[PDB]
Amino acid sequence: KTVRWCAVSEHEATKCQSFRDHMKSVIPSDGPSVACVKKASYLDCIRAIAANEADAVTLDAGLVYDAYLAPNNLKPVVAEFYGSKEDPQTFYYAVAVVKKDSGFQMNQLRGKKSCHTGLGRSAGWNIPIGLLYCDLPEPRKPLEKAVANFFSGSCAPCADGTDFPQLCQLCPGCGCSTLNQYFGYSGAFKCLKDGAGDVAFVKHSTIFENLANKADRDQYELLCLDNTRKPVDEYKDCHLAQVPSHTVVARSMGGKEDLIWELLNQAQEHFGKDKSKEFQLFSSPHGKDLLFKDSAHGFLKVPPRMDAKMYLGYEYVTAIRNLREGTCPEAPTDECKPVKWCALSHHERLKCDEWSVNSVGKIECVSAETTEDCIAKIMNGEADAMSLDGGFVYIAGKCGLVPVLAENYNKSDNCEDTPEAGYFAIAVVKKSASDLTWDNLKGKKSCHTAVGRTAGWNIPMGLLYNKINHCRFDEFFSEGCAPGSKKDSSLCKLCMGSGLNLCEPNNKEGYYGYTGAFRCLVEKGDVAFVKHQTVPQNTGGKNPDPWAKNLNEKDYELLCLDGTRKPVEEYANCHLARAPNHAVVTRKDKEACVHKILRQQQHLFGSNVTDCSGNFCLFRSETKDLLFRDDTVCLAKLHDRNTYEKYLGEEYVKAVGNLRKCSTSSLLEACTFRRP
Ligand SMILES: *[C@@H]1O[C@H](CO)[C@@H](O[C@@H]2O[C@H](CO)[C@@H](O)[C@H](O)[C@H]2NC(C)=O)[C@H](O)[C@H]1NC(C)=O
Ligand SMILES: [Mg+2]
């Protein structure tokens, strides 16, 4: 139970050894211990960790990436944080500050005038130039000269003035000290404030540190990667890169990550920010920033399904990858790159393969084990598009992806130009039970289409989470019928399935499905969770079955969240959530291409086509609902709804989130770690 920490200096090793001793005192024989391995450099520490001679070292984003690469393959496991638990600030943001209404975007920086914090600085140079690399003119080695030919004039502190003078044009001599008024963060910002430069590459924090009044900040904007702008307040939605300020790494396989976290968590409990004055984890007696930055206020456990690329973010890896590999294609700037679609089953891959050949190369295919792994592929560029249900549209939204096309299921003349927004989830009750409203629901008897289902379970129980705030969903209702629950649960007591079918989510349960839950309402329930048309189609002699011949709509009302009851036809105003259609999800920087390609694609192999055997067709599956749901007639454009929050109702998001507090998704907890 020992963590072998790696030092990169004699002073660091000394701090590690006193950390070992102090951890010795307070900790029982069982549990964390510290070993102090000492190597010559961060690179050497990485190669030692990979070679199982050390276990943990804490690194700057660049070395995080270095450690990620073959043959080391280390991963982030714990993260220093630089404020409070309520506002960690484990990351910072590299941004491009500009004058308000200066009239240009990220893809128009050529010819403009630049202000950098310093050459080799991450936010001031590495990140922006990395992203801009391919826009630099062809003799891209040496980099300083290509940057010089890119901008008309620059201040690039610490650059080689004598050889590349345009980089000192705004700060002649390129002083690498505060002597140069345009050096550093405050200097790169004053370079812009003084109108010397058109753009300043700095950190999110910098505008706030140099301008106290909101008034003056309001004449500054930020360049976003999508070639829009935003106010400086909104850097979390308009940054060049998000960068983890200081990250502990361990081996991927066999890394002891849990030991590292146990150890550091206890260490911060005993010797952290101020809670002891004998020894301070975040204070170097012999140097500065030994083992850990002295800014740090504490540690946070990194979610277990984070890999380096996911942690750093696609922008950052683009930046370093460009600056190290230095490979730009010659592909024509305007044309779209073939969209690689993500398959999660053997038959999904076979369908996508046929599609690819018939797409004459416009579509390609990428297999991945699971849905979440596919989403990961979209985020990090290994894949471009896939179709998701509501819940995964939400997880992908929290991961920065966007919906772009909705699967439309209702045939119509011009369905490409009208998305559908889905059916309505409702909570039905019988008028004969007058005192029932959304609030007293607790302790009453209930009927669900089936556990897992969207209208029968997810939306209702998600909205009710707030009236319970724990994950024992069978304790809200006295008794119920929720097919799929465990048989000895109270949510199985009212199910009427015979033999082995008693509580099984299948037709033989008979209180299963929309019809079945409504039957459970009329026969033995107080409330039943279904969609808007279930009552109209099981009443008035529309259902011939014995129980359902003579029931009439008037007898039932449906429960509204405001605490009032409403009639069935008024579902549009009385509903719990809007149960959404499947939607094609992609990364923002590919939204356009996807839009275009898919549309072309659904003209050919789309529902219009007969002789589906003589030619390929995109919405017919050999098995069931491969790639797209087989109901799809078209893919409808999501103008004005191209964000997970907009595409999914406010109510639906409330419900799915609340649920996800009980059913964790490792991907979702990673993504929320990077963006709360
Ligand atoms: C439902 O079916 C048709 C599409 O073929 C459309 O129904 C329309 O409903 C509105 C409101 O009741 C009427 O005013 C229109 O006259 C109907 N049109 C037709 C053709 O029936 C509607 O577009 C479809 N709904 C969805 C979501 O696609
Ligand atoms: Mg001591």
Numbering used by the authors: 4 to 679
From the article:
A crystallographic model of glycosylated apo-Tf was obtained at 3.0 Å resolution, which did not resolve further despite many efforts to improve crystal quality. Some extra density could be observed after the second NAG element, which points to a potential elongation of the glycosyl chain that could be the key factor hampering crystal quality improvement. As has been reviewed, glycosylation does not necessarily prevent crystallization—it may even help—but the resolution limit and diffraction quality may suffer. We can conclude that the glycosylation is perhaps the main reason that all the efforts to improve crystal quality were not successful, along with the high flexibility of the structure, as shown in the SAXS experiments in the solution. In the solution, apo-Tf remained mostly globular in all the pH conditions tested; however, the co-existence of closed, partially open, and open conformations was observed for holo-Tf, which showed a more elongated and flexible shape overall. Indeed, 90% of the available conformations are populated by the “closed” conformation, corresponding to the initial model.
Human serum transferrin (Tf), also known as serotransferrin, is a ~80 kDa glycoprotein that transits blood plasma, whose function is to maintain iron homeostasis by transporting iron from its absorption site to every cell through the blood vessels. Its structure consists of two homologous lobes, an N-terminal lobe and a C-terminal lobe, each subdivided into two domains, in between which a metal-binding site is found, thus allowing Tf to bind two ferric ions per molecule. The Tf–TfR complex formed is internalized in endosomes, where the pH is more acidic (5.5) than in the bloodstream (7.4); it is suggested that this pH decrease promotes a conformational change that induces iron release from the metal-binding site of transferrin.
